[PDB]
Write a protein that binds this ligand. Structure first.
Ligand SMILES: CCC(=O)SCCNC(=O)CCNC(=O)[C@H](O)C(C)(C)COP(=O)(O)OP(=O)(O)OC[C@H]1O[C@@H](n2cnc3c(N)ncnc32)[C@H](O)[C@@H]1OP(=O)(O)O
Ligand SMILES: Nc1ncnc2c1ncn2[C@@H]1O[C@H](COP(=O)(O)OP(=O)(O)OP(=O)(O)O)[C@@H](O)[C@H]1O
Ligand SMILES: *C(=O)CCCC[C@@H]1SC[C@@H]2NC(=O)N[C@@H]21
Ligand SMILES: [Mg+2]
Lengths: 261, 247, 673
């Protein structure tokens, strides 16, 4: 008798639930879906193939070596799927696990799918919901950001890259969306700012709320960072499919042609 | 001008206190040949310095942070000023030398409303896109995404050096301590440990993020040697008509 | 330098700068462990790193770093050093420091407390000197209390009257009164700042010596009642009553007068019972009459110049005497060997009041050790900074030779080969002093700079031949730079063809004159025709070295190129003085006549704070007569404090911003016009 079979099932059940049912409910009370629900809505039914499901973060400082601080998948869901029969690579950041903050494994998974996409010649769609870099992780959080930035710059003009900010993105998590070709936001739940309002008050001594500092309205009416804003997550993802139907699948391909009436 | 000329005057130029500033132009003048420096945009966006100098008789483009102005914080104007110079130097086969002392990006409502994200992405793009040899020296500070946008080892940089006064961290000690320990009520000992362990160039050295921790006297010599070797650097990138700058 | 004899195991050097380096060097050469003290600022000074052990003592200011006595006591407590050496200044002339150190276990290199107290006040000093049957300056015994008494005394003590302040130093509380009204109002004013300066409130009215020569006698004593006089020294070229250039032997004094002065000094030392190194200062008129005036109960700053003519290490003798051994040399062992001259290099601008202290950081610093007969005493290295908390001393440059002319020539050569970049020094004034006709002849006095430069130091007035040589060198350097600009590496795609220009016709603007120069190159030799005068300049033309040696018509010269611009401006240090020239090509010179000369508004008044943070402090106040290049209202930041400076020159109009001002990316600040 071997228990190496129930270990896989336990890790799978932990991976689907992410940061626990309580955090799923807290996410739901904010009017937000989870990463896997977003991926299911975006892609064609029964076409998502996940990669790096069991990946675990290798930090061992500040008491993160404990079992309670270990989440398989580690705050990002990556894979490939089909939109109307056309291949695409996708990652969605899970806000429940450590606030979606990027770590070594988070960046590792993102870089893996980006490398596959540039190898085969398919676009990348990134649903961003992340609190920045993992402070306890250390400098390799900066290393992971820099790897993601380098792959964003290398792939620019080779494959299309779409960004959709689904929640509050802060710190260094704002440069990868800026380096991609297009950027969309969701009203009333998505934010984009390098520095939070508290630090701004400490420094600039100006009382500014998060919505009016980095909200979708600010970035779509007076900043020039985002390209469009959508009412909620479902509407945003439907519009994302509609928009993806336009683009060529790679720079080696001609502009798509559809049947015309 | 011999390539192995020592510059001992740089051994104490960076003050011990993190609150006092220095002039990066003194470092630039000491390092380069004959202390000759042609500055570009000398009166605009003064918290960054860009210019043309010569190392061992070879033209080099120099970009650095100026701690005198805005404590070296990056903003919109400095980002664009550095980005275009870096792109020109890359396009015409000119090596780049960077001096890093940056606490981060300038905060405020005006910076966000003006689109600081786009222009910071411009500078990060320009540094990541370069295929000419790149040398980087960190003098005092490299915090946050700023450290990543100043030609880090991870943007396919060639040689990265840190002076003994350098320090690489995710963010400042205060914010890191208060966010790691939400409810410890022992901020004193926690901050002491954090500044003892992570306020020094060793965390980046043990992971290999810097080639070496060099003495400030050898800087010029070191750089010259690198520029002798990287003169034949060739890299290959995927084909494309052109790229999509974050402009 | 025999290490067999037992000597103090550890000495704490309670000083800083060049003297600390000197004593550390002479201790290391004698095989003794050394411990140095320093403030927080001088944590990377030369003496700290050169010493075996270092102790931080306090903050930047001298009142809490080197004048903090209890800090020295605790430092000596942990370091458990056997002895302490104070150098000069600081705590070298404090009775209570010596008493408290000698109390527990610490031996002091220097004089005893009673000797310092005896020769610490001018009243007792003069009284004992009169008791010591030596010549004294004429005057009235005691201190005058009222102006009427002073003017009454002035009648019988000579019409020229001088007022001096008791105790103190640095030439403070001193001046000259000529009339009875001058006598009384000068006495009243001197009494007015007597409390402010030192608090002794004791003044001296007496005769003023006209045309005086300040002559020093180096005396050395021990605890066995033996005293020697180590020849004499001449310290007459002074400004602000402070010596700058001084000479080991004095041409004025012959053998007999020197012997008389030495015997008088030895007798005075025996009367005071001196048991260490010291110096006795006399004033000598033109009639070879010497009057005693003060003696220093410590090591003298200009001590090294008298070591070269004698070959004795004064600090070694001080250490051995403090150990207890008697002098190993008799009076017959003291002799004059050659000649020696030395100058003080300060960080001051000699164009303002013969020197005004200046601050900065040394970007470049090189001393001329390789030259023959040159010694340098300095605690300064590249990267050092001249602060406002200490003496602006940079170096002491000593030269020695077989006679006066050789020493002066070697000193001029050393001054020409000495590289300082980062601050402003007084080397121009020093090199003018050492080549003056009066100084070479020797007709000098304490009023040398007052009458040699009645209008102040104006620089170096260069003759026609020197002007031609300077113009030729500048033109040759310009052409050499232009020629070096043409040497690329081979391209093999677009070959480079060098221009075939044979003669360079240049217009050189110097001072307020324009000269026409024709320069031709023949490899390493330039033929330069300046206004019809032909000169031949040859050199290796190394354009990167700070020092450039050239030969103009066989005359060897050393010049430096401090600045150079593409617009033709160039600053060249020639013969120790910096000249600004503007070299243009002939066609460019012709075209320049159409350029309209533009006026400068010079009303920078809107200089802003960099960050959108808050203010932390206000450095200045409205109307403080501050012009430019100094802190006005410092700013605080996320980390770095912004050293906000001024705008245009003048007197600050107003400062309105207060600490903690919430600013939106910048701040209206100091206003000038
Ligand atoms: C590379 C540059 C950097 O290092 S930037 C680092 C600073 N980033 C920040 O977001 C500031 C701190 N975070 C916040 O203020 C907010 O949580 C943000 C993320 C902005 C969104 O607000 P909100 O929707 O209310 O989230 P929340 O308060 O409920 O916090 C939930 C949990 O998420 C975590 N989290 C977030 N970011 C990080 C991070 N970089 N490193 C470590 N943990 C992070 C928080 O610790 C928080 O924990 P908890 O579950 O409330 O106990
Ligand atoms: N009675 C005097 N008559 C003329 N000149 C004098 C007289 N006393 C002092 N001086 C001038 O002042 C110089 C030194 O003056 P003084 O002794 O007051 O200064 P000090 O600061 O006490 O010096 P020291 O370093 O010797 O203690 C002399 O070298 C001389 O130039
Ligand atoms: C000094 O600046 C302490 C470091 C804080 C960094 C601040 S806050 C977050 C922003 N991101 C960045 O890179 N700089 C800004
Ligand atoms: Mg005196």
């Amino acid at each position: 008798a071997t228990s190496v079979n129930e270990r896989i099932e336990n890790k799978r059940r932990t991976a689907l639930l992410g940061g626990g049912q309580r955090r799923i409910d807290a996410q739901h009370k904010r009017g937000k879906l989870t990463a896997r629900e977003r991926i299911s809505l975006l892609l064609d039914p029964g076409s998502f193939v996940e990669s790096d499901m069991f990946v675990e973060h290798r930090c061992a400082d500040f008491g993160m070596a404990a079992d309670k601080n270990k989440f398989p998948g580690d705050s990002v869901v990556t894979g490939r799927g089909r939109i109307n029969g056309r291949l695409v690579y996708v990652f969605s950041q899970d806000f429940t696990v450590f606030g979606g903050s990027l770590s070594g494994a988070h960046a590792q998974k993102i870089c893996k799918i980006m490398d596959q996409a540039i190898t085969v010649g398919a676009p990348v769609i990134g649903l961003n919901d992340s609190g920045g870099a993992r402070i306890q992780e250390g400098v390799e959080s900066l290393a992971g950001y820099a790897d993601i930035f380098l792959r964003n710059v290398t792939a620019s003009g080779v494959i299309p890259q779409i960004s959709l900010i689904m929640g509050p993105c802060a710190g260094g998590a704002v440069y990868s969306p800026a380096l991609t070709d297009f950027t969309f936001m969701v009203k009333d739940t998505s934010y984009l700012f390098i520095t939070g309002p508290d630090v701004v008050k400490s420094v600039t001594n100006e009382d500014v709320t998060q919505e009016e500092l980095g909200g979708a309205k600010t970035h779509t009416t007076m900043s020039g960072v985002a390209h469009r804003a959508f009412e909620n997550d479902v509407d945003a993802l439907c519009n994302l499919r509609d928009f993806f139907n336009y683009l060529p699948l790679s720079s080696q391909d001609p502009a798509p042609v559809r049947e015309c009436h | 001008d011999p390539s192995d000329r020592l510059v001992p005057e740089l051994d104490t130029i960076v003050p011990l206190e993190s609150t006092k500033a220095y002039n990066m132009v003194d470092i630039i003048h000491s390092v380069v040949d004959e202390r000759e420096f042609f500055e570009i945009m000398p009166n605009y966006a003064k918290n960054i310095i860009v210019g043309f100098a010569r190392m061992n008789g070879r033209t080099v483009g120099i970009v650095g942070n100026q701690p005198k102005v805005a404590s070296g914080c990056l903003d919109i104007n400095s980002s664009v000023k550095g980005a275009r110079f870096v792109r020109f130097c890359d396009a015409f086969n000119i090596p780049l030398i960077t001096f890093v002392d940056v606490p981060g990006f300038l905060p405020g409502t005006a910076q966000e409303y003006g689109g600081i994200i786009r222009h910071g992405a411009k500078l990060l793009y320009a540094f990541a896109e370069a295929t000419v040899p790149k040398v980087t020296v960190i003098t005092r500070k490299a915090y946050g995404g700023a450290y990543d946008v100043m030609s880090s080892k991870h943007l396919c940089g060639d040689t990265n050096y840190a002076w003994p006064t350098a320090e690489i961290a995710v963010m400042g000690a205060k914010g890191a301590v208060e966010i790691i320990f939400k409810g410890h009520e022992n901020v004193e000992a926690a901050q002491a440990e954090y500044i003892e362990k992570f306020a020094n160039p060793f965390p980046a050295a043990v992971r290999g993020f810097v080639d070496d921790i060099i003495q400030p006297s050898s800087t010029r010599a070191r750089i010259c040697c690198d520029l002798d070797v990287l003169a034949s650097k060739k890299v290959q990138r995927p084909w494309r008509k052109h790229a999509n700058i974050p402009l | 330098y025999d290490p067999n004899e037992k000597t103090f195991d550890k000495i704490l050097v309670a000083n800083r700068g060049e003297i600390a380096c000197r004593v550390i060097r002479t201790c290391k050469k004698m095989g003794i462990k050394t411990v140095a003290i320093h403030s927080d600022v001088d944590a990377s000074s030369v003496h700290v790193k050169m010493a075996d052990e270092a102790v931080c003592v306090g903050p930047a200011p001298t009142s809490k770093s080197y004048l903090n006595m209890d800090a020295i006591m605790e430092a000596i407590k942990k370091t458990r050093a056997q002895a302490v050496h104070p150098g000069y200044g600081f705590l070298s002339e404090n009775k209570e420091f010596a008493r408290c150190l000698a109390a527990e276990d610490v031996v002091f290199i220097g004089p005893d407390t009673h000797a310092i107290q005896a020769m610490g006040d001018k009243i007792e000093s003069k009284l004992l000197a009169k008791k010591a049957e030596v010549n004294t300056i004429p005057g009235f015994d005691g201190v005058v209390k009222d102006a009427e008494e002073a003017v009454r005394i002035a009648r019988e003590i000579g019409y020229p009257v001088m007022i001096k302040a008791s105790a103190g130093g640095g030439g403070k509380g001193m001046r000259i009164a000529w009339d009875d009204e001058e006598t009384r109002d000068g006495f009243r004013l001197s009494s007015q700042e007597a409390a402010s300066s030192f608090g002794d409130d004791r003044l001296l009215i007496e005769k003023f010596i006209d045309n005086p020569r300040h002559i020093e006698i180096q005396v050395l004593g021990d605890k066995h009642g033996n005293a020697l006089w180590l020849n004499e020294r001449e310290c007459s070229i002074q400004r602000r009553n402070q010596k700058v250039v001084e000479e080991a032997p004095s041409i004025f004094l012959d053998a007999e007068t020197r012997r008389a002065m030495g015997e008088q000094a030895v007798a005075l030392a025996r009367a005071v019972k001196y048991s260490s190194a010291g110096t006795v200062e006399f004033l000598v008129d033109s009639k070879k009459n010497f009057y005693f005036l003060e003696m220093n109960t410590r090591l003298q700053v200009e001590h090294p110049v008298t070591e070269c003519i004698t070959g004795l290490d004064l600090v070694q003798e001080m250490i051995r005497v403090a150990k207890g051994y008697p002098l190993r040399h008799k009076q017959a062992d003291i002799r004059i060997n050659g000649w020696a001259v030395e100058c003080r290099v300060y960080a001051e601008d000699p164009y303002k009041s013969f020197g005004l202290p200046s601050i900065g950081r040394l970007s470049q610093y090189q001393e001329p050790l390789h030259l023959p007969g040159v010694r340098v005493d300095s605690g300064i290295q590249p990267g050092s900074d001249i602060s406002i908390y200490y003496d602006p001393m940079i170096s002491k440059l000593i030269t020695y030779g077989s006679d006066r002319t050789e020493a002066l020539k070697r000193m001029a050569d050393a001054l020409d080969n000495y590289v300082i970049r980062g601050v402003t020094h007084n080397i121009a004034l020093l090199r003018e002093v050492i080549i003056n006709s009066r100084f070479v002849k020797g007709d000098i006095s304490t009023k040398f700079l007052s009458d040699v430069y009645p209008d102040g130091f104006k620089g170096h007035m260069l003759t026609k031949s020197e002007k031609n040589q300077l113009l030729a060198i500048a033109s040759s350097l310009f052409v050499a730079f232009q020629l070096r600009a043409q040497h690329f590496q081979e391209n093999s795609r677009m070959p480079v063809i060098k221009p075939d220009i044979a003669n360079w016709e240049l217009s050189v603007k110097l001072h307020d004159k324009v000269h026409t120069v024709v320069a031709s190159n023949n490899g390493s030799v330039f033929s330069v025709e300046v206004d019809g005068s032909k000169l031949n300049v040859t050199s290796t033309w190394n354009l990167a070295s700070p020092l450039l040696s050239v030969s103009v018509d066989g005359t060897q010269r050393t010049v430096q190129c401090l600045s150079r611009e593409a617009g033709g401006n160039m600053s060249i240090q020639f013969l120790g003085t910096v000249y600004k020239v503007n070299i243009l090509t002939r066609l460019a010179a012709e075209l320049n006549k159409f350029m309209l000369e533009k006026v400068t508004e010079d009303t920078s008044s809107v200089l802003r704070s960099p960050m959108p943070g808050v203010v932390v402090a206000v450095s200045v106040k409205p109307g403080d007569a501050v012009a430019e290049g100094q802190e006005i209202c410092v700013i605080e930041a996320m980390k770095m404090q912004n050293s906000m400076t001024a705008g245009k020159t003048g007197t600050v109009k107003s400062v309105h911003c207060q600490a903690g001002d919430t600013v939106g990316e910048g701040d209206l600040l100091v206003e000038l016009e």
